[PDB]
Symmetry: C6
């Protein structure tokens, strides 16, 4: 029932995000916290500083995004298999929710990590760490590269979803 | 035999909980105890303080909940395959037990963790740790985010199960 | 050839034990010995004290129990597939051996771990540890919770197997 | 083409050895060398003492044994599938080689580990460790229990293979 | 629709790259950063020096390359399955993009790692490491061997893709 | 199209090498470098000495050998499936290349590791390690046993491949 821009391109880009996330989950972000060390001798400051600068990691943000993005698609597949009416409205609503999930997660990424580029050193000033301590991020450049790849793919998904809605509206009218 | 509110929505939400739990099991809670350190030099206080504040972890609580929730569904599938009567009563009983398991595990979550928000620092006062020691939770914010997601999905399951019972009762009458 | 009490309930409970054991194997008991530390500075006392108090871990005891319990079931399936007589006697013998394996492993659990509740601190007095040393068990409460779940499921299996034998005897007579 | 004593019992026991070995490979013998510590401060003596007392571990000895035992069975299956004559001689030869592999590996186990019972402490006197040092085996009792299970299953395989040869000879004559 | 030089040789070489990358991902590059130590006592200099000399690791560069190389192939397969016109132009465009991805990633490898040979010692001069510190690469020779294998396979892919384009053009004309 | 000596024996031996390599990859060679320690206090000498004495590990040498050995077999399978002429010449060429790969990798094993027997202690004299330092190999005897098994299987493959060529030549003439 889908048009060519979402049947082929959107599915392939989604598979691309799946494969990239799987590669970068255990490998790039495997030692995100274990190798996250701070210049201070205060016990327990590695954990609090890591949590302060990484409230939720990129992989798990992308993992949650991919699950949320695929949820309307899973709903349609579950709904179609059980019904088998006007399923066109159901599909366009699912695409709209998919677009909203992409936009929301991209905006969440902007809020959580202002500036899509990891930095080697982060200035951590939180209890119990005295004054400001220097904590070092594991693989900042590698994480930045995969962040650019995932964000670019997400932006492509946003554009493709918008084109999907426009194409379906034009098809209806 | 199920209605639309449980055939599609409840199944999709259950799959959502499965995928989120799988993502958050090895990744978020992988280093829950290894990186759980306390400010004291007393040997063995990391283990006792972790056990005191985490009698059972969220992932394993959710893992047990998902197994328990799916158990009445597994019973019906096993019963139907072997019988192949009035299976409607069997299904509604399974839904009621599924609702009870969701409510019980949510209440257990309330008892074990009063306040659905991890804190960076926990005040541990237990033998052999002298007086009160400061122990630090690994990824408190990330665990809090996944706790909110899982609890929200569980609440949706509770609402959907209640709607399932009401819809079936209305269908019968 | 089986009756309803073992065809459905016993199989589901067995699957429940499988899923719970898989969840609790790598997660709960993954760091049973690595995080098992003692208050003494004597080298090698962590290993000997862990072995003294845990001659065989609960997961491996349950893993061996599940393999042993499923062995008569595997024998019948292997025997039936190769024969395809009076297979009723073969089935009831397999159920009896399954019941005996459940009872033996439960009794073994009683002998190895008198008192089905882990304790945070264990008093270890064994060579080369001088006098008595304080060793700390990893996740004592979480292991206790899963021990209760597994033992309760095993007790249900014992009751269901006894009911299976009684039902088959009543059916024959 | 096989008789009942090897078609059912031998196959089930082989599956039992497979399942037990898989359970005991990553779990029991996972930390065989990492947690193998010696009482000396001499660097590198943990490795040489572990190698001296464990030239080849039980799991890998059993893993090699299971591969070798299944090799004549794999040869027959490969030979039959490609031929599809007097395959009875081929089968009995495979059983004889299977029996020889079981006996050889059991004898190898006797030579490598005289006395089928792990000991907590081993007296290591090898370069560069000065004089005799005390090294501690990880999970000696748990490894002993699984050693007894595997050796008992191997002995059952030896008896079943001998019965297989005798039954086939009686069938021929 | 493909000719023999790409249907057989290109596919086999791609499978060769997949298998080699899988073997060398967890094994060779598993401890790339954990065992990457520097001669300095400055905290956090292992991470910054590793990132400076390895902005993105070879395995993840190859993993991204393989995903990108297979993307036009995945697009054609997705497009063909949904269409089922002049698909010859679509295929040759996919081959051209595949060739460009191979060339771009090979050039990226040249830029990121000038000189396709790992060195045991790297001179790291970056904040906060004082002056120049000596950092040691894990398995430099083994990584060099797999780098040569992967680059040689990539060069073969480039040559085969060029031959694919030439053969198709000759076939058309 | 293959004769009996390569259809059955060569395939079974190849499967034997696959299973042995899989068993010995994560288990025997899992801690090859992590537990490779040297008697010196010079930082970074564990890595350089390990690389000096193990330019490429046995498992990865065998993994590359198995991929290379199976490559001509994969080429024939890919070629046959796409053609479906004189495929006999193609098969014998593949066998010859398979024999050459076996011989080349065995000779490479001789060059990289002169003497097919691991030694507990290796005399490392390389920068920055001062003079000659004593480094200890992890599981030298266990690695030696698996080296003998793999080399013996490789020698059997060489003999079987030579017999395959001779048998095919005799069949043609």
């Amino acid at each position: 029932h889908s048009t060519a821009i979402g049947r082929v391109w959107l599915s392939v880009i989604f598979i691309f995000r799946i494969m990239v996330l799987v590669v970068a989950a255990e490998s790039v972000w495997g030692d995100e916290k274990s190798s996250f060390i701070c210049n201070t001798l205060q016990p327990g400051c590695n954990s609090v500083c890591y949590d302060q600068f990484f409230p939720i990691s990129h992989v798990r943000l992308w993992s949650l995004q991919l699950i949320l993005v695929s949820t309307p698609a899973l709903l349609v597949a579950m709904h179609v298999a059980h019904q088998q009416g006007t399923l066109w409205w159901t599909y366009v609503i699912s695409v709209v929710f998919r677009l909203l999930f992409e936009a929301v997660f991209m905006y969440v990424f902007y809020l959580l990590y202002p500036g899509y580029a990891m930095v080697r050193l982060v200035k951590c000033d939180v209890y119990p760490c005295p004054n400001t301590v220097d904590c070092f991020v594991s693989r900042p450049t590698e994480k930045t590269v995969f962040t650019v790849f995932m964000l670019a793919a997400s932006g492509i998904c946003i554009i493709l979803n918008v084109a999907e809605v426009v194409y379906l509206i034009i098809r209806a009218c």
